[model samples]
Target chain A: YRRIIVPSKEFCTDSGLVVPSISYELHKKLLSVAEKHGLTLERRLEMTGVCASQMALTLLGGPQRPTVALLCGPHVKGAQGISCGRHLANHDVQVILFLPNFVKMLESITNELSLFSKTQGQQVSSLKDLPTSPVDLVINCLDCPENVFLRDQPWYKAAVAWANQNRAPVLSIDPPVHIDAKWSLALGLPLPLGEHAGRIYLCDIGIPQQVFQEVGINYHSPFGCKFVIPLHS
Target chain B: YRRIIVPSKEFCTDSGLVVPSISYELHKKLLSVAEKHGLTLERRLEMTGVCASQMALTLLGGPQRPTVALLCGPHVKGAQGISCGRHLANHDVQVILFLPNFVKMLESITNELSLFSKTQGQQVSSLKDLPTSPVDLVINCLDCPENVFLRDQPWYKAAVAWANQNRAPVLSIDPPVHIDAKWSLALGLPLPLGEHAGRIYLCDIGIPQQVFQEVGINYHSPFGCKFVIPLHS
Candidate 1:
């Protein structure tokens, strides 16, 4: 988790349009103002998680359902991860969410966990509880934008270390959590990450075009369908 | 608003994917089961309305926000129209919602209208209350899939007649609602609309690929971004 993801300021759309990316400060402002426009945190997470889950499902192709390992923390991004696991489980994928116990967590985490519990997916608290062998896919959502210190923590450190040892390639969401993921999903807009960020896919988290304007962004969605899009460098 | 629009059994995606269209019976079953999978009717209406509103906004491209006349009935379609108007108004578009007074209406209609009233847009009860000359655009939602007799109603007939007389092109949602629309938006999947159905645009109304499978459809969302997509014949 890094606070300064100074990604390429501009990215090209499938239809060949360039959109400017905002800094972390501006991105934070846009999300807060977006909620005032009726896009609540819960709804945003749901949309983001669903879009991410669909992309993951697409990656795990074939007639046989694949097993997925979900790594989450105790922040907003963690809630998004749990939400993804829920939808993935609902789709018949075997989802094992490793949420490692925490003394305190965001209300959104509890909220998402409650919803996640409704699915067939199971949750665990220790790295030992994870599959001894590599799962088909490892979704890394253990990092939060502002809270990169999560990497220094005991549980997350062992968790990330364990993920790399697994044979499966990781598909990290939002800002890249370590693990050299084979793919990374960008929410709303892309952020600058190192060369290891993997294939860049952008997810539509439902920030209205007008809402962007409210945050001083002259935005026209490059997405014609407006869900999640795979971006080419 | 006709019950039987056996549109082409297949439609090609922007990415050259050919997706099969479903019959009204299957479409109904798909929606019911989709909700059981967590996509509620309220959420569906919101996503539909937002995508439709965004398209209308793009159509009215200009330095100044354009005036839009919204025509709605008392059914579910009408609720969708009101939701669109609310978002359009929220985006600074000039919206005039013509909701004819009725003895009874769906609960969704009232729910949408309450949210709509939060905007600065105005509401009317008659064609006389509409703008005398052509406004920027006309959104037609006065017809329902199962309620084709809406065309026979006095208020609806007069409203459609006035719309044609006002010299504005109509953009009808769902099944065509007459008035010879310049464009029509098909929700989730396209229906077999008539030749006068105009340019067909498909809105992604959040039907999961798994949910489609439950209804015996082998579906993959043609939409990667997941909003409204303009289709070519």
Candidate 2:
């Protein structure tokens, strides 16, 4: 399980806006990290979590108030989507958060948002714990190998039905077609579904916007990651 | 300063809603008490505080998210307007409440709506303390004696200009127009400018939907108070 084969620089290239000098430098650093750690993911996606949230927030606006239900597994849990809510709340938009499992992570995430008073549960086994009447917007954040279907399969169908009955808005961040395809807002940040390099397709915990800012080296950069490359790849 | 005059049954009849029915029963009882105690006024309007607030709420909800401003006197200061806001919040709407002066009754009214966080003193001495953003709504609950607008004051304009720039909705519910004709959303209620009132608008706040279910009361009856009225001449 621990064995991993490092991928070469040729496999690490999809820097669209990366300046040449910085891109070259980052590529070298990534190579060094890869060699040292023997990291294996050849195909990966980055900077999408923020984009997905922005799209969802845009859709959350309008006369119909929706409770966005966030459903993420333990692997991908944090306060990354908080700024999205804050941006909308400034315009008088309400957001409803629903997270299944990730009990410890829920505290850490809510602590960052300074909304711990509204935190309901970390691991809600029963959907009854979900806020019922007042929910108008819902966003789910579930990205894991094993439990992808847990949120997508049966429960999601019920969520769609409920959304229809309540005339609520439902959105999922990732590009997984897990939720009912008819959901009004569906953003696909399809990070490769399966394994590419030596790293197995286990799970990729979505990083916080702060981490993306760190990667981008600019706090002002919108919450997506940007790799700094060196003079030459 | 102490003046009380109870009105005749004609005053109750002028209220328009049923005089002997369950809804107007409170009105009759209160008027009887007023008669017994002899509460006089400079002039009496033919409407209840709740009725005035209802008009304000409807005007506030049309096209924009109104930031409700107030100039409440000691009497009915924040009492009537807060009930309107509570109903709006229950509808998943946001409102910014402003109180020009602090009074004990204002505190009690604010507490009832769970919006007691309004700052008491002048936010700042200069325009700096004034909110940089335009207020989308304005409400004045001042109890000036004769009129909402100061008479023969050619140069004075109620804060309507500030409200207009922001395209915000404005509502005024006080005894009289203390400022000028410029105040938008003006409604006449039983209060004194810079004074206090014994009873507030929306007395006996209606039961919440959940509370109605718990008490086995029909939610429709209380909710119908929002619209239906059995006119009694």
Candidate 3:
């Protein structure tokens, strides 16, 4: 059996700093403090989108135009993915966004979708509308920590099945989803994701050191020159 | 003398891209188009400051709090240095800003200085007020491209002398003021900085691909995952 467990969910730096992982509770604290200090939800969404789209583009480096399939839910993670889709579309990537319509959607998601419309991209709510042929890459932002019952939805089940069965590799963001991701991106700090989480990468969403200290984490960014850096086990 | 002339001032990437060197005129065109497309001067200043401070922190990695001497002129480069100083101070670095009082300063410089005052940093207007002993590092921003006559200013001459004679290694930001730097930072595209410019590091100041294309360069960012990346001749 492959060991995908990060011991204590800790990330170690090349400089030998052991950065401990935060719980959903602590992550919420960081987010709250950040927003209180002017890092509004919208700003955070844009920063994450910029960092994620940069990572996605780096992975899909190609001589010709690359097509990306983005699977999203109706939560913060989904908003982040939609924002990323917007940026990827702006950068000339053929982004096909798949966010199955929910009875209700977060304002952030609609805002991001609004911006994504400004780009030359496609969006579909029905599974049949998705590309039958394999895309160059698939971005899975379908799993929301608060809403796991999404697994029971017919559209959700069909989308995950398509992502899993497709030839393209998946890149999961803040995942709790059971999809097999080739890479996983963590924000601020790494989370306790299990086997299907794949290789870990961290994105710097521009949170200040004082914000981390405000929440009792002596966080020093290991990212030196890059916005995105790989995390070691 | 070590040869420092980059052949035709062109930057070659490991990915087999030959990004041509840009002229000051071309750089101005890029800045104009970027501002027209919403990357305003203040936003660009902040992004450059963020990237520059990150690079400076990486260079000043210490187990204990490190002291850094920041030298600035009266223009955009100096404003960038002042902005960087503000961030470094916020990050626990002891930033001693040395920008001799001038007859007139740019609005950007004043704006950045106003922000820098919010941090627990010291601002000195005289060479005598500067540290006699060498600090951990020196950040030289004493050069502005348009104002070549700044060298004739007594304060500019003294500050450059202090930076050169200091034992601390120097990191020049968009350099031309002739201070020997261990590292030099370039914004957008690298300028034809001759030797004494030290190792070239290019900062991705969040310029979009469309912005580059707007300036008539079919540019692709070599910075795959980085906001700041090193350049090769």
Indicate which candidate wins on lDDT. 3
lDDT of 1 by residue, A19-113 (tens): 55666777788788776655567556666766677788788873355899999888887888987787677556889999888787677887666
Task: State how far residue B193 of model 3 sits from its true place (Å).
Answer: 3.7
Q: After superposition, how far is residue A72 of candidate 1 from its true place, in Å?
A: 4.2
Best by DockQ: 3
Q: Give residue B201's error in model 3 in angstroms.
A: 3.8
Q: TM-score of each candidate? A: 0.61, 0.27, 0.66
The digit string of per-residue lDDT tens for model 2 on A1-233 reads 11112222211213322211123333334433332321112101111222333355445543243445444434433243342343233223444444444345543344324321222212343456566664655554444333545555555555445544544444444323223322322111112322211211111221111222223432111111211111112
Relative to the true interface, what fraction of contacts does candidate 3 keep?
A: 0.02
Ranking 2 against 3 by lDDT, winner: 3
- Of the pair 1 and 2, which is ahead by DockQ? 1
State candidate 3's TM-score.
0.66
Tens digits of per-residue lDDT, candidate 3, B1-233, equal 22112224766555545555677888889888767654557656766776788889889873357899999887888998987887687667888999877787578887777657645689999877777898999999988888767789887888888988879999998885237788999888887766788888888665656666666776655664466677767
Candidate DockQ values, in order, are 0.09, 0.01, 0.11
Model 1 lDDT at residue B231? 69
Give the alpha carbon lDDT tens digit for every residue of B177-230 in model 2.
123322322221122222122112221121112222322222222111122121
- What CAPRI-style quality would you assign to candidate 2? incorrect
